[PDB]
Ligand binder design. Sequence first.
Ligand SMILES: NC(=O)c1ccc[n+]([C@@H]2O[C@H](COP(=O)([O-])OP(=O)(O)OC[C@H]3O[C@@H](n4cnc5c(N)ncnc54)[C@H](O)[C@@H]3O)[C@@H](O)[C@H]2O)c1
Ligand SMILES: NC(=O)c1ccc[n+]([C@@H]2O[C@H](COP(=O)([O-])OP(=O)(O)OC[C@H]3O[C@@H](n4cnc5c(N)ncnc54)[C@H](O)[C@@H]3O)[C@@H](O)[C@H]2O)c1
Ligand SMILES: NC(=O)c1ccc[n+]([C@@H]2O[C@H](COP(=O)([O-])OP(=O)(O)OC[C@H]3O[C@@H](n4cnc5c(N)ncnc54)[C@H](O)[C@@H]3O)[C@@H](O)[C@H]2O)c1
Ligand SMILES: NC(=O)c1ccc[n+]([C@@H]2O[C@H](COP(=O)([O-])OP(=O)(O)OC[C@H]3O[C@@H](n4cnc5c(N)ncnc54)[C@H](O)[C@@H]3O)[C@@H](O)[C@H]2O)c1
Lengths: 418, 418, 418, 418
Amino acid sequence: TGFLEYVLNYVKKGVELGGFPEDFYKILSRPRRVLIVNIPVRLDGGGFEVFEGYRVQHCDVLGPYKGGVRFHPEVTLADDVALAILMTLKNSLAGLPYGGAKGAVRVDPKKLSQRELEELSRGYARAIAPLIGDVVDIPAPDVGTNAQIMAWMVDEYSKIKGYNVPGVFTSKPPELWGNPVREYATGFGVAVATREMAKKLWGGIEGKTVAIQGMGNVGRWTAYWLEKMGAKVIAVSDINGVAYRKEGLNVELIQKNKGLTGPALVELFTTKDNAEFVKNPDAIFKLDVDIFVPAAIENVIRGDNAGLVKARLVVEGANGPTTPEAERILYERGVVVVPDILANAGGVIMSYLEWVENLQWYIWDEEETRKRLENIMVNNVERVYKRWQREKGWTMRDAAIVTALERIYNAMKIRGWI
Amino acid sequence: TGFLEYVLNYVKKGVELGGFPEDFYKILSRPRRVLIVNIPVRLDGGGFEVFEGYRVQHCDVLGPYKGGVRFHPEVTLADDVALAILMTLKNSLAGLPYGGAKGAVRVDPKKLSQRELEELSRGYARAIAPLIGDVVDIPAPDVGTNAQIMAWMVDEYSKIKGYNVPGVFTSKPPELWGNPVREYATGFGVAVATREMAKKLWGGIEGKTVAIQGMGNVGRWTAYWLEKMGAKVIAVSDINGVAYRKEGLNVELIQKNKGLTGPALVELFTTKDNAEFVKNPDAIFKLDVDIFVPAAIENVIRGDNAGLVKARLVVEGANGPTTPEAERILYERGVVVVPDILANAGGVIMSYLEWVENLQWYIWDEEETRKRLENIMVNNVERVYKRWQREKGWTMRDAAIVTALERIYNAMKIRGWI
Amino acid sequence: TGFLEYVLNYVKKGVELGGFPEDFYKILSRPRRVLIVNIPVRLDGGGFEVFEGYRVQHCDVLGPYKGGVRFHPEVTLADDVALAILMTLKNSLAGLPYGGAKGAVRVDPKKLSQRELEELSRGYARAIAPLIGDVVDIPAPDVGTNAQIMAWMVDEYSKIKGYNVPGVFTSKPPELWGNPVREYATGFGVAVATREMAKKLWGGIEGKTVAIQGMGNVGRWTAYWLEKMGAKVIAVSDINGVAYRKEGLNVELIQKNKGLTGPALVELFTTKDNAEFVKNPDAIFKLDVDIFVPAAIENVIRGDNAGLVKARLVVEGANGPTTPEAERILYERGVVVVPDILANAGGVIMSYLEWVENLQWYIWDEEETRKRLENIMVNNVERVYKRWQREKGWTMRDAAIVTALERIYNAMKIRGWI
Amino acid sequence: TGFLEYVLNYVKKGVELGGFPEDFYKILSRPRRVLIVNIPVRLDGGGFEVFEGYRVQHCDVLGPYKGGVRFHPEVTLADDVALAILMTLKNSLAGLPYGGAKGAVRVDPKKLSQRELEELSRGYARAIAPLIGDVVDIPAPDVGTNAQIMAWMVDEYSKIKGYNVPGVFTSKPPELWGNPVREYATGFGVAVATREMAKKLWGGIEGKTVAIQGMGNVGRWTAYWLEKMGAKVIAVSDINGVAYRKEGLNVELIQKNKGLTGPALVELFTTKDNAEFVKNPDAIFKLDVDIFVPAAIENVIRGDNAGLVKARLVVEGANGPTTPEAERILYERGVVVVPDILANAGGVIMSYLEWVENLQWYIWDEEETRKRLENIMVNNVERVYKRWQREKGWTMRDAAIVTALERIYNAMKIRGWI
Ligand SMILES: NC(=O)c1ccc[n+]([C@@H]2O[C@H](COP(=O)([O-])OP(=O)(O)OC[C@H]3O[C@@H](n4cnc5c(N)ncnc54)[C@H](O)[C@@H]3O)[C@@H](O)[C@H]2O)c1
Ligand SMILES: NC(=O)c1ccc[n+]([C@@H]2O[C@H](COP(=O)([O-])OP(=O)(O)OC[C@H]3O[C@@H](n4cnc5c(N)ncnc54)[C@H](O)[C@@H]3O)[C@@H](O)[C@H]2O)c1
Ligand SMILES: NC(=O)c1ccc[n+]([C@@H]2O[C@H](COP(=O)([O-])OP(=O)(O)OC[C@H]3O[C@@H](n4cnc5c(N)ncnc54)[C@H](O)[C@@H]3O)[C@@H](O)[C@H]2O)c1
Ligand SMILES: NC(=O)c1ccc[n+]([C@@H]2O[C@H](COP(=O)([O-])OP(=O)(O)OC[C@H]3O[C@@H](n4cnc5c(N)ncnc54)[C@H](O)[C@@H]3O)[C@@H](O)[C@H]2O)c1
């Protein structure tokens, strides 16, 4: 109910800004339908154990329910219900024909063997099965789960139905009806998001400075595709330190090191390439750069350090890095931040594309996929802009919240729900 | 949560007496599946309100989930999960091929308008529709619901399947595939069970004196069917006092004045039929009668008054009339008490008989229905007695919880669940 | 294929006798449908294995398919196709609305661990699932299978549909929606059949010396129920020897000590009773009784010992105990041989009742069930008797088969199949 | 069974060369499902007849089963099971999400009328109906069948589902949701493969000499498109003889005179083209050419003529034209032979494209169809080629098989099947 409150405030805040009837907020604060279950599993080493899991199907209007499932020992309904609501605003803002769901299972995957894990996975999918499906609810991986856990579920559902049902789960192995672009979908998306921002602020991202935080799965690929567009990745921090380069770091090294972890991949720019290694994860901030990209964790661009920020553009790659207090501070100095909800939505858009491909049992090539993925992204930005520019005091954040909140309201009205 | 904690302890006490593995208890302690739903209703005044509702489905093994739904404001899942647990054992004990479930909806029906109520009922059914059917989960009425509500849910479900589904809900109007016996179902059972226990103890019931407490739906019908079996109903009470007649009360008046409220029945036994009267509804405990039948409210026989009970046999028509302490007190005095899970099951069994009739689109006459109900009841009273006499230091209560718990245990074994 | 070539002629014989068209023979020759599956099992004590299985579905005119499933290593398709054909005729003759089928899985159940057997059993039900159902095809146990295996199958199929499906497999545990009367269903039937025949040849079975060969399941209860009808059993054989007693073997002992194996039973007759023991299971043949009942195995009355037979009436309780050559001889001596397809059909009939009960989720008492079984058998022997006497030269065998080929034939015509 | 043992051995090698566990061979060896059915047909002036048919569904891992249905009198199960295993491998190699299946009906269509042939075709689609469907099993034409027959099966299936289900059968009439490109699919694919194989060996087909064997449906269109790619068709043969012309045969005569049989087209080259014509058809094995294409029958290049071919590149147009022994020879003589499983896969590929179009109810133009078709084949070639070089001693066929076994094995592992 902690995190939940926050979301209930995030959405409630948006409503007041969009002048929406209290009735609208009503049907949004409560999930449409929630299924709680207890999966019984017989440990290969031992006796019995029944795990409690669930699926949160928040809203349907734009299309089928979409959302990943978590496998963490400290999970609760309220958080996922709260998360599910967020998933509804994201898809809506992404311009996808998706609803918003979120599932979970209370267990520590690091306590189960391959047999016990696959056993639980199959069990969870078989349990919620009567309520999911390729056109009703398409679960996806999250925290504990991964492409492999999804695969087992896809297979379990397929045996129940008696035929192969690929579209019921997304982000599955390339060998099991999946699309490879998923590897850098979020990154490529972050790069396209920002590239479009510059084209409207400075006229183009070409030849611009870039300071990315976190060479994980987001930051890493955000730097690669960024340069391919015309940016200069001069800094790429991480837990250890940073990698400076006034000419621009050689990101092409990332293609031949897609498994060189994040921290080590930071050293690579120091050991192999010739770059300045300033051991300190708090330097990329004050560093004189055009664009700063926090693609690591949350609570990074707080108020106590908001002053250090030198970049005039902040594309939130990580989830909720800039605190509300900082959001204000940064906006009153010129620095503008792009709503993470919009920027890192490339992940969902990718799952969407995988899904569409599954329905017509046809897989597109990398080039093909990347283009549609980009096209959507490019069109999502153009939308939030018009709203943002047609209002004073309204931050990108607010523009994005309303824009999403407005698509849902619109659908519900036409549909005759309110 | 305190009531649940109470039901779980109750189950443990039984899991041990029967000597079942803890794994068995692991499967029963948690419900098989829960479906929380939020149905929005358009009120007359204003236009919007979303209600909280759900359907707990405890265990399958003996057959489809069965259980009523509660329409009450102060409702919580925990308590309802507990009821579904008790509904599972009760069905097992009754010999019915039923599972056990329980649904609820937080709302006060005495606040909604006739229209709004129908709208809510149809919304509840339509929301839980995918998880119910005449062979998967058959709901029924409870505290805030009645026959009329069942009717609105039967019609709704039927307009969803595209044809008539009479067995998807029991306890429905006689004019809508119901069975008139429901009126006296429970009372007829209490009477059948009391007679059987009387036989296996005194050799016969008739001539035996009976004192029933409460002239409600259970009590008034128990006092009527018991006299038909030979008993001698000499005393009946309600909130307004007690009606005594040594020669014996004329129960025929009950059938000639059913629906004549409860307290008006008491005064009726005084006006028409000559009967003494005392302005004290607690005098029935004092009476020196052979059999005492509490058919009103719980905690009526506490440890602070157990020593005032003369009766040698106590048959529970209501739920929880005897306190765990009063139970022991009386027991070590020679007074045996017949468990409610066994005695008042005449209502649950009747619903079974209605369901079976609905599946074959054939409704038996009243005599046919009665004979099938009497048969089941009698057989149930046998199974509990035989076991009760096998162990030592075992109360009737104990025998039921184990006998019902053992039928579920074996079911899960053959099925390969444990 | 030798057994199949046999059955095909067994039928062709009936076709020429009844004078049915050859087009009829054509359709009844080949099975309507045949599903072959390979189930991969992960041997616990090992790695992998792929078992071969199938399910033959012969004729559907009378109603849904009904046959048993064999778990045996020497099972071949052809034999089962032949077994299917016979099952269709047997179900027709039995006066049931069943089409008769057959199934088998090549394996030695006595070579697989319990965990392995369940897995295999569950895989067979899962594989053929798309072609079975409480109203399309209801399997049953047979040689390598049993009630427990039937349970695992019902269970599996049920987790596939999503709800409980009892009527999908018969001969299931009494605790899992089965019926007790199945214990002695076959025997009782043989008892009723011999009783009816004695009423048409001698006018009553009262005081008739009977000799039962084998004390397994059939002979065991055939002897017990036979006495209750007035007959008197003097001899009973088995692998160990023969129990003689002209006064009458105390059959009540059979119910007292059931499940005491075959050979042990013969001894019990020597211990508790004063029966005379003879070390030779071929003595029963030489005995001069009124009614002989072969209930052990096939090829018991061959053409080399037919003359030795003294009984005036022969009732087959086993499958094919009388050899063809012997049937011929046994007949030109005034000895009537009641066909196995008519006498031991008590088993199929009992499976039909259990089924009819599951469809209505209502279980009948042993009384109701026994009486119903008896009824069907009587009208069968009756129906078969009228035609037998109508023709000259015909053997009960002929009359039996022809009666069967007739009900199926009349059905195909009315439906427009031929 | 001879061909079955042959195909089984053909796949045994691959399992070894690839280093897969024997478990893989276990499950891949036996067909998952086998539906055998007997369709009764009422002959015209005649009477009755029951035709035997079946569908072998081998392996559904990469996607829904796919395979053709044969109408030949000399048909046997084993052979069809064998062919189904090949289809399973072929579909894998083709990079299509297709399983592998094969159907057959034992009959000689050149004996039945149109009315009877229609009744047989519909009865077959109707008999297997429960085990097929646009996402389960998509049959197709083969020896005794064609588009006309598929049309009848599609209609019979559509009247069973209650709506039009076009994607259940492929290679159906252009007027019936089909695609024209099917006409030259195989030949175009063979042409694309060789053109791609040339580039790797030399650097282009432009200028290279080509010799084809048989101007049927495969060779004919292989020659047409081959020339369009820079090739120089100097020899086209058939049963009637050969046609040489070092300058290059004008293929325009093919398209314009499409549907002019095989041999006739050959004469047309001797009449409307100054090409030589030698009676002896074996001459094609002497002409020194860069590329040779056997597109007529099997057993064309054996051990007795292997050492005579001049071509440095041989592309298998027909099925199994090159003898195992001759393969040994030709290879150790510097001649590379392109596996038929890979080369003529063009028709199976097109079959996939027709399907995709049916699922989205949209038909592309010839250009669109050919681009996707060309791409797939080009990609299949690369995959095989790249793996072929990674090992020594291996042959094109060797790498082709393993390339196919790998995609399947991988999917089975990720799925938990092994
Ligand atoms: N592709 C996705 O899964 C996805 C989509 C939704 C949103 N985003 C969000 O992006 C964030 C990161 O995701 P990811 O996939 O890149 O994670 P990741 O786990 O692959 O990488 C995170 C990186 O952060 C670095 N890091 C930790 N603390 C740091 C600090 N103080 N300063 C600098 N670097 C630090 C780590 O060393 C690591 O390399 C999350 O908040 C996530 O929700 C990711
Ligand atoms: N047939 C059923 O619905 C059913 C089945 C399950 C269990 N029982 C249980 O039996 C009890 C009564 O059910 P019912 O359907 O007859 O209810 P009811 O409302 O028809 O009647 C209860 C009666 O109790 C009387 N009463 C209350 N306090 C009393 C007191 N101190 N002394 C004497 N009379 C008193 C009331 O005035 C009323 O007439 C409940 O606890 C119920 O759950 C009933
Ligand atoms: N009850 C049924 O399931 C059923 C229904 C169909 C037909 N019948 C047929 O009846 C036959 C027997 O079945 P069952 O279930 O009673 O078998 P069972 O296995 O229970 O008992 C068979 C008995 O035959 C005895 N036996 C073997 N050889 C003997 C010999 N030479 N002389 C004397 N006794 C001998 C054994 O010792 C054993 O006690 C089978 O052929 C079966 O197919 C039975
Ligand atoms: N397009 C397809 O359907 C397809 C796909 C799978 C594989 N291939 C295989 O290709 C082979 C041929 O198919 P098609 O469609 O061209 O067949 P087709 O019947 O249309 O043509 C074959 C041609 O081969 C000629 N021929 C036979 N023996 C010959 C000889 N000794 N010398 C020269 N010519 C000879 C015939 O006269 C005929 O014109 C078959 O084995 C088939 O399975 C075809």
